[PDB]
Write a protein that binds this ligand. Structure first.
Ligand code: RU
Ligand code: RU
Ligand code: RU
Ligand code: RU
Lengths: 173, 173, 173, 173
């Protein structure tokens, strides 16, 4: 039961629970990405740290969604968290491409939810997504696109050297 | 007269003046609530302080609306402020229920005004309501709902003891 | 591939991956427990904080296991994370009982893994489990047992009052 | 003579003296490795510093074993220290491979000694090896494996450039 729920559709409630699952899944993917780059036969510390930090950001995103759900009088419902789509993540560019795909899928889910809340006449929801989700995704996708362009510039000729240098001089900051 | 007014309907201007009256009325209600809990035969200091602080918040809300009205080139028009709906406010749960009803009525008035500004194609207005009104109401209603649940848990068996304890251990922080 | 793996069986490697899944599942359970106690109709902040802190501890446990796996030249393999066993968690004593059951299951999994590593003649593994897992579980289970005894003492007669008081005077520290 | 010796076999005493010789030999190997990379025609300062620091760590390991030997009432017996297996150590990857082989041989000697102390029912000994030897070796071997993977990534195409860059950007920290 709730004594506080007001202007909060069952449709938005359900969509928020689904977005929580997507963010938690994305966090799980980044955890796998991080530990893959910590393998002794991969060994790219700056790449591991980049992905581990994203694991934390996505988890924090899911927690903010859960807090919002309760603030509105909605009810958190958790689902199975699917394992990540790969066990091994290839080279730096492969991993950075997987990350951009992942983030674009989150951004699109946010866009779909804002497009649901506006159809539900729910300004609080739109305000909330705008505030700590929409701009964050845009900034993060730009950074990943910048990274990918640099990796690709580096890995054209001498792939090993380029991967090392990107990790040392871009990611180890 | 105004040399600055732009994209600001007479409809929104009037609605803002009405919202000012509602916030000022809510402030007056909380002032009465606060002094009721200061009566020697009621004597719940943490409950008095809770309501007095809300009197101040609602007044500050009305003042921000008035400042916004002038920023847009609208004109403040003040009306009679109706006395609060009760002279005596019962027990803590009674008062906390009255507060939630009050805040839900403010939130609904904000929702109605955002739903007017969007119909008026007035993004500044929506931005303004989102920024210091919509989220504030949501957070405040959640806190009141949390309080009410705790009071109700406490007041089930031994009502006097429960009221004392809630005031001492939740409100006296 | 690995250039470092030494005295590390495929059996222990697999068992470590399973223990990672169990710790991550336990973290997920505590996340659900934490947000349940944040519901406006439950509203026990100290209980929410207790479970949220355990969510973090179990996640950190899984990450230390993953780091260890890589230090030994083993390979992390992630599985689906099952959703928690309940959607709603009842009263404080119900939740604290579920937590003890959960922690006992983790402890037993650790005992089983130490009993595998000794059968594998793997001292590093035993040392590692002893160091940041076995004693931690014992201390945590004792604290939960202490909590449960206090809740049960409190909730015998007047259940609402007892739950409130335990949250205010034990958990809100 | 000793007035303190208790539960300390002549077998463990002898094994500890042999482990002292192995650690001192490993220290001697690293001293040679360090000074080789200080040659004007080799000149890789970060590689020299890496090996010189390992010379010190292995010596400190032998001294802790000697202190332990006396704490138990055993008697230190020193043997000839064989000169290192090479006079010249090749390139960075060659040297890092020699180091991993060396450390794996130490780790295996520790494992053999823990497997002797357990057969001797000597918990103090196991505790001691676990505490400042087993985990240290594991961490060190992981770091060397990480280094080797990076060197190998670097030295694939342009070996001189890769060796320089690894020394400047990984080892010169
Ligand atoms: Ru919007
Ligand atoms: Ru709007
Ligand atoms: Ru053991
Ligand atoms: Ru042992």
């Amino acid at each position: 039961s709730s004594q506080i729920r007001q202007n909060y559709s069952t449709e938005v409630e359900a969509a928020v629970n689904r977005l929580v699952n997507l963010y938690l899944r994305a966090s799980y993917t980044y955890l796998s990405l991080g530990f893959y780059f910590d393998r002794d036969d991969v060994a790219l510390e700056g790449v591991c740290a980049f992905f581990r930090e994203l694991a934390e950001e996505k988890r924090e995103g899911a927690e903010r969604l859960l807090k919002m759900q309760n603030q509105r009088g909605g009810r958190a419902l958790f689902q199975d968290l699917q394992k990540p789509s790969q066990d091994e993540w290839g080279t730096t560019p492969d991993a950075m491409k997987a990350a951009i795909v992942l983030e674009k899928s989150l951004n699109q889910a946010l866009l779909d939810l804002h497009a649901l809340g506006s159809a539900q006449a729910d300004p609080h929801l739109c305000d909330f997504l705008e505030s700590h989700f929409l701009d964050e995704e845009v900034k993060l996708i730009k950074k990943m696109g910048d990274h990918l362009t640099n990796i690709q510039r580096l890995v054209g000729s001498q792939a090993g050297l380029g991967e090392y240098l990107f990790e040392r001089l871009t990611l180890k900051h």
